[PDB]
Design a protein around this motif. Sequence first.
Motif, mmCIF file in Angstrom:
data_model
loop_
_atom_site.group_PDB
_atom_site.id
_atom_site.type_symbol
_atom_site.label_atom_id
_atom_site.label_comp_id
_atom_site.label_asym_id
_atom_site.label_seq_id
_atom_site.Cartn_x
_atom_site.Cartn_y
_atom_site.Cartn_z
ATOM 1 N N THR A 284 0.823 -1.203 0.000
ATOM 2 C CA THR A 284 0.000 0.000 0.000
ATOM 3 C C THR A 284 0.861 1.260 0.000
ATOM 4 O O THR A 284 0.550 2.230 -0.701
ATOM 5 C CB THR A 284 -0.933 -0.017 1.212
ATOM 6 N N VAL A 285 1.961 1.262 0.762
ATOM 7 C CA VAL A 285 2.790 2.462 0.821
ATOM 8 C C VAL A 285 3.754 2.512 -0.357
ATOM 9 O O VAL A 285 4.249 3.586 -0.719
ATOM 10 C CB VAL A 285 3.540 2.563 2.166
ATOM 11 N N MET A 286 4.043 1.364 -0.976
ATOM 12 C CA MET A 286 4.942 1.393 -2.122
ATOM 13 C C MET A 286 4.189 1.678 -3.413
ATOM 14 O O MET A 286 4.752 2.255 -4.352
ATOM 15 C CB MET A 286 5.739 0.095 -2.208
ATOM 16 N N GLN A 287 2.914 1.295 -3.479
ATOM 17 C CA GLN A 287 2.062 1.804 -4.547
ATOM 18 C C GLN A 287 1.599 3.223 -4.239
ATOM 19 O O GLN A 287 1.180 3.959 -5.141
ATOM 20 C CB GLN A 287 0.869 0.872 -4.760
ATOM 21 N N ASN A 288 1.670 3.628 -2.969
ATOM 22 C CA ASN A 288 1.303 4.980 -2.570
ATOM 23 C C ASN A 288 2.461 5.955 -2.733
ATOM 24 O O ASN A 288 2.224 7.169 -2.742
ATOM 25 C CB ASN A 288 0.820 4.974 -1.113
ATOM 26 N N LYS A 289 3.692 5.438 -2.865
ATOM 27 C CA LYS A 289 4.920 6.222 -3.065
ATOM 28 C C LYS A 289 5.158 7.205 -1.920
ATOM 29 O O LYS A 289 5.669 8.310 -2.111
ATOM 30 C CB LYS A 289 4.909 6.944 -4.418
ATOM 31 N N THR A 290 4.795 6.785 -0.712
ATOM 32 C CA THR A 290 4.854 7.647 0.458
ATOM 33 C C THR A 290 6.055 7.293 1.322
ATOM 34 O O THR A 290 6.246 6.134 1.698
ATOM 35 C CB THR A 290 3.569 7.523 1.274
ATOM 36 N N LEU A 291 6.867 8.302 1.631
ATOM 37 C CA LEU A 291 8.000 8.109 2.523
ATOM 38 C C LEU A 291 8.006 9.264 3.519
ATOM 39 O O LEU A 291 8.979 9.496 4.243
ATOM 40 C CB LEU A 291 9.296 8.033 1.717
ATOM 41 N N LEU A 292 6.900 9.998 3.555
ATOM 42 C CA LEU A 292 6.721 11.104 4.482
ATOM 43 C C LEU A 292 6.510 10.651 5.918
ATOM 44 O O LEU A 292 7.100 11.235 6.834
ATOM 45 C CB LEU A 292 5.523 11.958 4.045
ATOM 46 N N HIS A 293 5.703 9.616 6.133
ATOM 47 C CA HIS A 293 5.363 9.167 7.470
ATOM 48 C C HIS A 293 6.143 7.940 7.912
ATOM 49 O O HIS A 293 5.848 7.394 8.978
ATOM 50 C CB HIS A 293 3.860 8.874 7.557
ATOM 51 N N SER A 294 7.120 7.500 7.130
ATOM 52 C CA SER A 294 7.952 6.364 7.496
ATOM 53 C C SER A 294 9.304 6.536 6.812
ATOM 54 O O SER A 294 9.621 7.585 6.242
ATOM 55 C CB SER A 294 7.270 5.050 7.107
ATOM 56 N N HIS A 295 10.117 5.491 6.866
ATOM 57 C CA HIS A 295 11.366 5.459 6.123
ATOM 58 C C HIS A 295 11.718 4.007 5.865
ATOM 59 O O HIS A 295 11.234 3.104 6.551
ATOM 60 C CB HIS A 295 12.491 6.183 6.871
#
Lengths: 151, 778
Positions: free
Chosen positions: B703-714
């Motif tokens: 979900t976060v890798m299809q979401n391309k989100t690295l703001l709330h995690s690392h």
Amino acid sequence: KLQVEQEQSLQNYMSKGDWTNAFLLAMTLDHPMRLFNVLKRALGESRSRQDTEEGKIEVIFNEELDQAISILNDEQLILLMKRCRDWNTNAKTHTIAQRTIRCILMHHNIAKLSEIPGMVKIVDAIIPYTQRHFTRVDNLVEQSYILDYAL
Amino acid sequence: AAAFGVIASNANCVWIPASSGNSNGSGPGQLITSALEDVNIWDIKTGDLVSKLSDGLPPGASDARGAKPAECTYLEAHKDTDLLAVGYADGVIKVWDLMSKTVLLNFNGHKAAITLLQFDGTGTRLISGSKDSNIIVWDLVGEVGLYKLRSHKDSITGFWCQGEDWLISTSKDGMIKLWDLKTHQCIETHIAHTGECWGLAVKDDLLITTGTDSQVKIWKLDIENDKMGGKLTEMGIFEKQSKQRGLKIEFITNSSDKTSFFYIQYSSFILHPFQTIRSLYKIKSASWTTVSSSKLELVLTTSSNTIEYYSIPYEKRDPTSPAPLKTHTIELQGQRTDVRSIDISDDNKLLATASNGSLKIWNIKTHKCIRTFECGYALTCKFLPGGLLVILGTRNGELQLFDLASSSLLDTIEDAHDAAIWSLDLTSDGKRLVTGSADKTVKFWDFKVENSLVPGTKNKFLPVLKLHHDTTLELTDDILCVRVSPDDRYLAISLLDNTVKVFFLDSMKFYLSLYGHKLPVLSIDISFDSKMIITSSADKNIKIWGLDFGDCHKSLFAHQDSIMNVKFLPQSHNFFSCSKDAVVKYWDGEKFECIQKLYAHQSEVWALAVATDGGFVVSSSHDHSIRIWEKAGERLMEALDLGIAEIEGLEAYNRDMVLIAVNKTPEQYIMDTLLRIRMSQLEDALMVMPFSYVLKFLKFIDTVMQNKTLLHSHLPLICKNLFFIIKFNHKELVSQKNEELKLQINRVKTELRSALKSTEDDLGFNVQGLKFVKQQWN
């Protein structure tokens, strides 16, 4: 004075808008923590798509900052660079401090155009922390494939 | 024992003077209600006591009021005249019934007192800015979580539009802040001041400001990239308030320069003749200006403890200004100013307080007549025993004889003094007068009717008592308090050498001096048992004395401010303290302990005496009136079950025809528990979890890798947890069948290795790019 505080109110407002004149306007002003917030939001998410110079593209155009560094003077470059020195220390922030570096190395000449201030301490100060964070991602990269390799 | 006084808010008090006006509100149009040390109800054109809201007995409540002391900040009526609402000198705002004087709600949340309070045009919102430098919006429910706007350092002055949105603000920190109503943000702050915004008024379209800079700045409503059209400079001193006419054809301005001036072609200039006036503007700098609701007058609120009425020269209104009318006071603010001395009669019906220009006669709360000869305030006042005549001591050294019937002075008592009279008291029958004077002597005075060659009505001065040359380092010859023996055997005197001396009625022989006083003494009194005395000094210390010297009984020291008067009881059992710190304390004359501590006083008490009846309390004051008395991992399992419970529901949303975890996507809570958890001992919470936790778990990584989100995690967090669960269990010890999550991992890891490989390549060019110019710069 008056235009300074009203300019801070415009700096408050423009963050709701775009990032480019908020970046230059926040560069000529106080304070660099909000300047870290706009680089945090603009630079923060994972993306590796179409052509950038510092990783700034979105649905809204952020490549104007790709222009705005090419016009920038050396005083804001060294005033930026001491902040990158402030941001390379703690973990996960250094990467944001990386993002302008691959920018600025593209833009200006090898002279760092001729009227260059003394920055030998900073350019000496950046490198061992870069080698420090480099080995970490070396480890995670060589550890990433191995869960796939088993079955 | 038993003592009088009560803990209630009212004991038939007349302590409210209804004075010191600072603002007001228009009510029915033919009436007007006024901010004072109460809520007062005046006619808008006659000036009579229509009604008065103060302390008392509200219908259905005890220890409740209609209004408080400790001066009201603002006062206004609702536009439907249904609601009363007053902010006071405390942070709590009180709303009141309009027909009755019961309370509806009490409003707090304020660290300081109210500096702004007004109804909005809707009526469902009441806005209050206070001196804790913020704004609080109020709803009829009491909604304070709507808007709390604060970016200030001082109080606020300017406010509302009439459109439910798009507010404005001008503040007292030299700032004019602009805010929107939807999601408030300071778009722009116009600043033209350096001090305090005193008053504010929008005319209908032009917002002028009045501040310390003695100028006027005009501003347009539809404003962006500041609209400036001009400034009106130099009225002569800093301006304080202004007001628009209800017809909005004029605009009156007021200042502390004793002048008010309006604008007309309104305009940017004053263009009307002003020599038609007859009732010149003001004798004391005014606080606030409102146009009258009869469209013919002007209503002015001054700082001379009263507010007044005038008019503005115009053809529609009255072209001159009339004489100011005042309300029907009880003769407590009908006269001028504060009370420094009171005196007591023996019939409990003649009680007199003095002012700068008045003597006021009282029985309990009903005023008979005034007596006016006063060349100052009175330091002392004294009736005749029997209440026939009264003797006054002004701040000229002059004693005055007044009859009880009329205002006229019968006889001026001989001004043999050169300094004002500190103390004065008569004897039992009242034929001997002992006074306070710095003339280095004690002056005895005769008294009788006028039927002989020796005037007893003018007090001819036969005997001279003078030995006062006692040498000291503090002050040799000045007296503060004199006391007559109740047995009529001796005279007690206060002295400025930190002593007192006792001596009988005839020629000088010595009884007793008392000393040990770090500060000089204020008041000395005698018990009617006549064995023990008290003394009050300026060291916050009250000293008891019997007959010894140097052996200290008790240092009665529990105070913080200066002591005005401490007296015994008229039957000598209760000595009481009035001081500077606005609190009056009862003290048992047989013990050392207090029985009642009366604190209902907000202003300064100058003096206080209790009559021989002992059923009421007479109190001089600074507001010139009398207060009469008587684990984590299961939360992770709930997080994954809730999250997959969301994702599985969103999958078959319409491809095939919970309020909180937290976010628009629930997976952000999944990382947030990874954010909240400590860096140590997390493997203990992770090792509990079964294999189905993994199957529910990797969907969020996809979900976060299809979401391309690295703001709330690392990525070291996700790979850190990944490497923990692949240590724990498992891939082929959890499943031997080719499944969908198993094939999901094969692309998710590719996404991860590319996403980290990007930044690794970025550094891999960065540091070698840094080396090369450092090779050259040598």
